[PDB]
Design an enzyme around this catalytic site. Structure first.
Site, mmCIF file in Angstrom:
data_model
loop_
_atom_site.group_PDB
_atom_site.id
_atom_site.type_symbol
_atom_site.label_atom_id
_atom_site.label_comp_id
_atom_site.label_asym_id
_atom_site.label_seq_id
_atom_site.Cartn_x
_atom_site.Cartn_y
_atom_site.Cartn_z
ATOM 1 N N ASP C 47 -9.674 10.716 -5.264
ATOM 2 C CA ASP C 47 -9.232 9.565 -4.491
ATOM 3 C C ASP C 47 -8.961 9.982 -3.054
ATOM 4 O O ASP C 47 -8.071 10.797 -2.795
ATOM 5 C CB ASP C 47 -7.989 8.944 -5.120
ATOM 6 C CG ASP C 47 -8.276 8.342 -6.478
ATOM 7 O OD1 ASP C 47 -9.467 8.145 -6.799
ATOM 8 O OD2 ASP C 47 -7.316 8.075 -7.229
ATOM 9 N N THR C 80 -11.549 1.986 -1.579
ATOM 10 C CA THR C 80 -11.121 2.706 -0.385
ATOM 11 C C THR C 80 -11.975 3.943 -0.170
ATOM 12 O O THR C 80 -12.299 4.306 0.966
ATOM 13 C CB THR C 80 -9.658 3.109 -0.518
ATOM 14 O OG1 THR C 80 -9.528 4.045 -1.595
ATOM 15 C CG2 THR C 80 -8.827 1.902 -0.841
ATOM 16 N N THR C 81 -12.336 4.614 -1.260
ATOM 17 C CA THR C 81 -13.231 5.755 -1.164
ATOM 18 C C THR C 81 -14.568 5.346 -0.555
ATOM 19 O O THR C 81 -15.223 6.141 0.126
ATOM 20 C CB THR C 81 -13.412 6.369 -2.554
ATOM 21 O OG1 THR C 81 -12.138 6.796 -3.051
ATOM 22 C CG2 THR C 81 -14.336 7.564 -2.505
ATOM 23 N N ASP C 378 -3.954 -3.031 -9.823
ATOM 24 C CA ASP C 378 -5.367 -2.937 -9.495
ATOM 25 C C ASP C 378 -6.114 -4.169 -9.978
ATOM 26 O O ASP C 378 -6.958 -4.709 -9.256
ATOM 27 C CB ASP C 378 -5.947 -1.675 -10.125
ATOM 28 C CG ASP C 378 -5.265 -0.421 -9.638
ATOM 29 O OD1 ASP C 378 -4.603 -0.486 -8.580
ATOM 30 O OD2 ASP C 378 -5.358 0.614 -10.337
#
Lengths: 514, 66, 509, 127, 102
Positions: C47, C80-81, C378
């Site tokens: 992450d 986000t990655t 999430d």
């Protein structure tokens, strides 16, 4: 910095290797104990997989990572942990080649899975349901003991090990929680080890001959003293002002004989007869005249007892810890079936033994009190886990890696994948298995080669679990040998070795973080 | 709101506002304005007028005078 | 003072060196980066948000790289990655060429035109979802929690979030935002099982309430949110000198106590058994509510009271004279302080506010809850992405190679210079399926060409390579999916910094 | 342990006392200016010419026949004698009334500080 | 030992009456206000020493410009006697104590 891709694992593979070499004999009676200076700067000896890790101050992250992960298994077994380091990096030594041949470490981590499962499947198929016979317990105890200490040291100690667990299974406890109390004792030699079904306090208080030999022991564990103080000011009350000190001088000596004669009452309250030695046990001190006023009545009062004993004594005797004395029946003060204050050296170690429901068996080891006596303090509790594991699993197999081959045989013999992708991993997977039994033999004696092609063809002949004779270097039936792999023990290394190898096999960028 | 072509100059003053309610005329043609920088609320007072106590009506009718 | 091509290459060098293992980290097949510390702390993480903070940043672009990853991490937190992936690519692929071929802008202009092409192509390949069917969502949410790789507890966190998110679904700007997350309020409860955790109308406040806060069980009777203008007046209508001395106690409390009386008697008319005082809370104020025969509650966060404005669903009023149910504490209201585990918990139910249930979370421990809790956090991001965008789009190469040919054909139909950015952009897409093939363990350029053949004919509609199985696959059939939004958004974000770092030719002080 | 407290308990008493005495003395002198304003009230009230017993020496008062009820002292400076009107006294008094007012009030916080502090030193001594 | 507080006494001594003057300082500025607003209405005596004397207005005025010399003089002089005594006090503290202990 960054050690990129192949380089990052090249670090991982290396850090595994040299340590695995240490543990090729850290394992078995052949296993060679290892000592630690720079781990502390103390003179330190240890044999076991994970503890030696923690004992050393290990700068390398791999080892630093390993000490934590092998713990969880070393929590359970304690042996096979001295084994566990081998298979892991050896599997790296397997797969790194394949990725050096070129391949994804992905598919090999992938590839290990179904092999792990067939192993897990085989682990079921291999695991031999065995009985709870103390004999069956002895061989599981001693094989871990044999691993960790001398077979002699394994033998002589094994009895007390497999004994207490019977009384802790008398509780019907599936594991070992109490009766884990070990006691190192002043001696010229670690040769002396005793099994105390009850407990042992180390003190007779300060007063001898209190009727310190006690057949009927109604156990008063009292964390409050009969020694508050003999002087003017109270135990916790301190005064540098003059007029406040003259206040406490009169009744400080009294509130002792308050609590003293409460026992003197409590004696006759419990007993009425000096005949039954009544055992007062104090977590703190007790006045000499308090002891005197008690001892003459036949009251044996113990002072400066240990909180674990207080715990133990409360539990083992059905005992009680008390902040007051007053008067109570014999049973309100839990009963020890036997109590004897035993002087060795100077210190008189009270044997409080076969306490009513002796829930805690003190295993006493009389020795030099060196780390040598500490060096035998492990294999026992280690073996305790093992028999506890053997207690846990009725299913236990031959040791000495008889399973390894029979694993490595079947698991590889069939393709569990009938693929390359998983079998590639499967290939590497079941290969790292055989590292242990062959090198044991190879360290013992006959090379990896013969013993394998022995034990393989042997298993191929047998299907019996045939495994190395660690004093020969060629296989035997480790069911017959006595070296015995608990399914509780043997299973978890399959978890660890795989699950650890998973993510560590996949790294490319590495850097100082922060 | 509405559509984009419908964007128009307006003859008047644009107001982002709170338009009133309660029986307010929603349009008043040709009106003088009170533009209040202020906020009316009420001026919290228990007694400004009619101090007399006659009915429980009246006691609150005292503070009604804010 | 650094500038130009060197920076323009250094921008790539900064940005691109990140994503390398970070793309392998993408997908459940993932290669964790080891982060050792100068301290020696070892970190295995897939992450970036963790990876980004922990690493020495060699370049201010990396500092800028952090921003848009934090942006999406703030924007959604999903993918986000993936936001730093194609930002470097655009730069990485073309940049040196087309600035050697001389222009920031032709690529900068070709960022947008490539952008909407995907968005346009997306809405075709992004196909609507049933939010009416929670499972039509749940399967993605299940696909999302297996993206989070907890199907054990979080498959329930799926429902709990989903059921909540469908309820925390509402909002109106006049454009009517679909979800509202700042409405969604979870709880953190030891005791009970997360299977027994649920969602009820309005905002459950455990936030100020771990213990007695508003009585225990206030059934109908109101809670009073106070934005007044309650401050006890030292005089009657005027504030005078503070109270240092007996006379000040006598004279002023004379004038003080009647004002809170003037105030919290206007409170007693709205039928509270409890009054939670956020403003005007002071030694006299709550003292008079027990004299007003209503429980008073002290110095509380308005965040709750705004959550509570979504709980009973009321507003909050600063009106000193006018204090009512509609003003504060709308609906019949249910104020229930329940001890779930050892902690007393205000549950404000009977929501008067559209839909709007908020989350009971009670785990046997805090921790057993937390595994649900994060993926439920999430899943709500996932659910809302399904809600914000109700077009489920096939995950991976299916959504990937599709747009590329458009972009190429686009570039080819444009046949200008900007063709090269699109040719760069269309090829910039192919990394992730390649990366997935990189990740899966198969040969990508084969599977790439194979996936090209999946587009050459199918147009890669539902067909990418599936990094888990590493094969050309039907993402419809696989159920591999995702909302257009986060797909768009994360991608649309990945465009932005490439626009930035290409715009920025001067790094100075 | 308690030896610290026992010294700490005894010390914190006296500063309560030292301050308890001070402010208690700051009311009186403050009150005489009130009364010097008051003594002036009955002064004007009766008339000029009354017999006034006025402090004479130890155990004596001298009677005297009043004149000019408007005559008042105001002592300012160090000892300096300022004779003032019946009006000027009352405000100059009220200044020094207000002057000792704060002087009273400065003491109480430091008066009370050494008690609750000492009170905390009593508990851990016994407890 | 004796030499400690010998100096701190007359330190504390002239300290407070000096501070008494600070009250009187305001008064000595106010007595410049009070007498200057006295035109001879109320009989102005100096109170200067124990004899209370029939006085005149300039005698009243020039005196309080001279009465401020109280707050002027007594305050200032002590800031000497403050440290004049303080240092010799501080000096003598460690000397005689270390002896009697040593």
């Amino acid at each position: 910095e960054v050690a990129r891709a192949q380089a990052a694992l090249a670090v991982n593979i290396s850090a595994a290797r040299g340590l695995q070499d240490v543990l090729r004999t850290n394992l078995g009676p052949k296993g060679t104990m290892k000592m630690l200076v720079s781990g502390a700067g103390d003179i330190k000896l240890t044999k076991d997989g994970n503890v030696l890790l923690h004992e050393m101050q290990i700068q390398h992250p791999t080892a630093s990572l390993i000490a934590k992960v092998a713990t969880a298994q070393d929590d359970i077994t304690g042996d096979g942990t001295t084994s566990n380091v081998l298979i892991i990096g050896e599997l790296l030594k397997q797969a790194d080649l394949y990725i050096s041949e070129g391949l994804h470490p992905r598919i090999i981590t992938e590839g290990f899975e179904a092999a792990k499962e067939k192993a897990l499947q085989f682990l079921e198929e291999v695991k031999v349901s065995r009985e709870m016979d103390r004999e069956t317990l002895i061989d599981v105890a001693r094989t871990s003991l044999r691993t960790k200490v001398h077979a002699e040291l394994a033998d002589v100690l094994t009895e007390a090990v497999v004994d207490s667990i019977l009384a802790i299974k008398k509780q019907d406890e599936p594991i070992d929680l109490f009766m884990i109390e070990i006691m190192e004792m002043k001696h010229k030699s670690e040769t002396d080890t005793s099994l105390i079904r009850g407990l042992v306090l180390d003190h007779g208080a300060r007063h001898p001959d209190m009727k310190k030999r006690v057949e009927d022991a109604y156990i008063l564990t009292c964390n409050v003293s009969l020694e508050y103080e003999k002087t003017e000011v109270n135990s916790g009350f301190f005064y540098k002002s003059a007029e406040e000190r003259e206040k406490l001088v009169k009744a400080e000596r009294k509130f002792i004989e308050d609590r003293v004669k409460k026992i003197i009452e409590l004696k006759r309250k419990v007993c009425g007869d000096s005949d039954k030695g009544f055992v007062v046990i104090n977590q703190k001190g007790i006045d000499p005249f308090s002891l005197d006023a008690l001892s003459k009545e036949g009251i044996v009062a113990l002072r400066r007892a240990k909180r674990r004993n207080m715990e133990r004594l409360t539990l083992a005797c059905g005992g009680v810890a008390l902040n007051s004395f007053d008067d109570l029946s014999p049973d309100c003060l839990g009963h020890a079936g036997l109590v004897y204050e035993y002087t060795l050296g100077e210190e008189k170690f009270t044997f409080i033994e076969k306490c009513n429901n002796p829930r805690s068996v003190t295993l006493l080891i009389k020795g030099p009190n060196k780390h040598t006596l500490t060096q035998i303090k492990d294999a026992v509790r280690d073996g305790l886990r093992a028999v506890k594991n053997a207690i846990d699993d009725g299913c236990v197999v031959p040791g000495a890696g008889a399973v390894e081959v029979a694993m490595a045989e079947a698991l590889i013999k069939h393709k569990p994948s009938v693929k390359g992708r998983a079998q590639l991993g499967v290939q590497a997977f079941a290969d790292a298995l055989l590292i242990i039994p062959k090198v044991l033999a190879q360290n013992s004696g006959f090379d990896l080669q013969e013993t394998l092609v022995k034990i393989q063809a042997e298993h191929s002949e047998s299907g019996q679990l045939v495994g190395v004779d660690l004093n020969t270097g060629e296989p035997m039936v480790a069911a017959e040998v006595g070296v015995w792999d608990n399914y509780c023990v043997k299973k978890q290394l399959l978890h660890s070795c795989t699950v650890i190898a998973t993510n560590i096999l996949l790294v490319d960028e590495i850097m100082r973080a922060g | 709101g509405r559509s984009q072509m419908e964007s128009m100059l307006i003859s008047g003053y644009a107001l982002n506002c709170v338009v009133g309610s309660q029986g307010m005329p929603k349009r008043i043609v040709n009106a003088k304005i009170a533009c209040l920088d202020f906020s009316l609320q009420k001026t919290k007072m228990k007694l400004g007028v009619q101090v007399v106590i006659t009915d429980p009506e009246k006691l609150d009718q005292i503070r009604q005078r804010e | 003072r650094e500038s130009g091509r060197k920076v323009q290459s250094g921008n790539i060098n900064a940005a691109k060196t990140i994503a390398d293992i970070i793309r392998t980290c993408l997908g459940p097949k993932s290669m964790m980066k080891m982060l050792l510390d100068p301290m020696g702390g070892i970190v295995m993480t897939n992450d970036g948000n963790a990876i980004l903070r922990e690493i020495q940043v060699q370049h201010p672009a990396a500092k800028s790289m952090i921003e848009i990853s934090r942006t999406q991490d703030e924007e959604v937190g999903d993918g986000t990655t993936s936001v730093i992936i194609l930002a470097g690519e655009m730069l990485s692929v073309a940049e040196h060429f087309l600035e050697q071929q001389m222009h920031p802008t032709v690529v900068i202009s070709a960022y947008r035109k490539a952008l909407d092409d995907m968005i346009s192509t997306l809405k075709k390949i992004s196909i609507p979802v049933d939010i009416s069917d929670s499972d039509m969502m749940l399967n993605i949410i299940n696909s999302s929690i297996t993206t989070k790789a907890i199907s054990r507890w979080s498959s329930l966190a799926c429902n709990i979030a989903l059921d909540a998110v469908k309820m925390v679904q509402f909002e109106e700007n006049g454009r009517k935002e679909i979800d509202i997350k700042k409405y969604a309020r979870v709880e953190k409860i030891p005791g009970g099982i997360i299977e027994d955790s649920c969602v009820l109308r309005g905002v459950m406040i455990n936030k100020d309430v771990t213990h007695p806060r508003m009585r225990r069980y206030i059934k109908n009777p109101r809670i009073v949110l106070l934005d007044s203008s309650l401050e006890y007046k030292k005089g009657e209508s005027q504030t005078d000198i503070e109270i240092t001395r007996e006379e000040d106690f006598t004279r002023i409390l004379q004038m003080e106590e009647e004002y809170i009386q003037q105030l919290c008697e206007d409170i007693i008319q709205l039928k509270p058994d409890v009054v939670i005082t956020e403003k005007g809370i002071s030694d006299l104020a709550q003292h008079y509510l027990m004299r007003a025969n209503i429980t008073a509650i002290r110095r509380v966060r308005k965040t709750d009271n705004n959550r509570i404005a979504r709980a009973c669903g009321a507003r909050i009023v600063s009106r000193p004279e006018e204090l009512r149910e509609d003003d504060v504490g709308t609906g019949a209201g249910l104020l229930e302080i329940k001890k779930i585990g050892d902690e007393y918990f205000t549950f404000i139910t009977d929501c008067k506010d559209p839909k709007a249930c908020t989350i009971l979370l009670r785990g046997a421990s805090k921790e057993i809850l937390s595994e649900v809790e994060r993926n439920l956090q999430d899943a709500m991001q996932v659910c809302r992405n399904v809600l914000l965008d109700p077009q489920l789009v096939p995950g991976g190469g299916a959504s990937e190679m599709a747009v590329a040919h458009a972009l190429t054909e686009k570039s080819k139909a444009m046949t200008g210079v900007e063709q090269w950015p699109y040719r760069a952009v269309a090829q910039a897409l192919e990394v992730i399926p390649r990366t997935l093939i990189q990740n899966c363990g198969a040969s990508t350029i084969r599977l790439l060409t194979s996936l090209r053949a999946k587009h050459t004919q199918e147009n890669c509609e539902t067909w990418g390579v599936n990094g888990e199985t590493g094969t050309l696959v039907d993402m419809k059939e696989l159920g591999i999916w995702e909302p257009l939004a986060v797909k768009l958004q994360t991608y649309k974000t990945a465009v932005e910094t490439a626009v930035l770092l290409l715009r920025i030719d001067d790094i100075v002080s | 342990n308690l030896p610290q407290l026992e010294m700490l308990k005894n010390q914190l008493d006296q500063e309560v006392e030292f301050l308890s005495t001070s402010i208690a003395q700051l009311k009186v002198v403050q009150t005489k200016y009130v009364e010097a304003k008051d003594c002036l009230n009955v002064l004007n009230k009766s008339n000029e010419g009354k017999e006034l017993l006025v402090p004479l020496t130890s155990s004596m008062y001298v009677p005297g026949k009043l004149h000019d009820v408007e005559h008042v002292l105001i002592d300012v400076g160090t000892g300096y004698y300022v004779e003032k009107t019946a009006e000027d006294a009352k405000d100059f008094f009220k200044r020094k009334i207000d002057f000792l007012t704060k002087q009273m009030e400065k003491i109480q916080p430091a008066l009370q500080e050494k008690h609750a502090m000492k009170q905390a030193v009593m508990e851990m001594m016994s407890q | 030992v004796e030499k400690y507080q010998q100096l701190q006494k007359d330190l504390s001594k002239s300290m407070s009456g000096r501070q008494k003057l600070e009250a009187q300082l305001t008064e000595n500025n106010i007595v410049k206000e009070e007498l200057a607003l006295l035109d001879g209405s109320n009989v102005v005596f100096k109170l200067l020493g124990p004899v209370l004397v029939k006085q005149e207005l300039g005698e009243a005025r020039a005196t309080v410009g001279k009465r401020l010399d109280y707050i002027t003089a007594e305050i200032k002089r002590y800031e000497s006697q403050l440290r004049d005594l303080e240092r010799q006090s501080e000096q003598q503290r460690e000397t005689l104590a270390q002896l009697q202990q040593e």
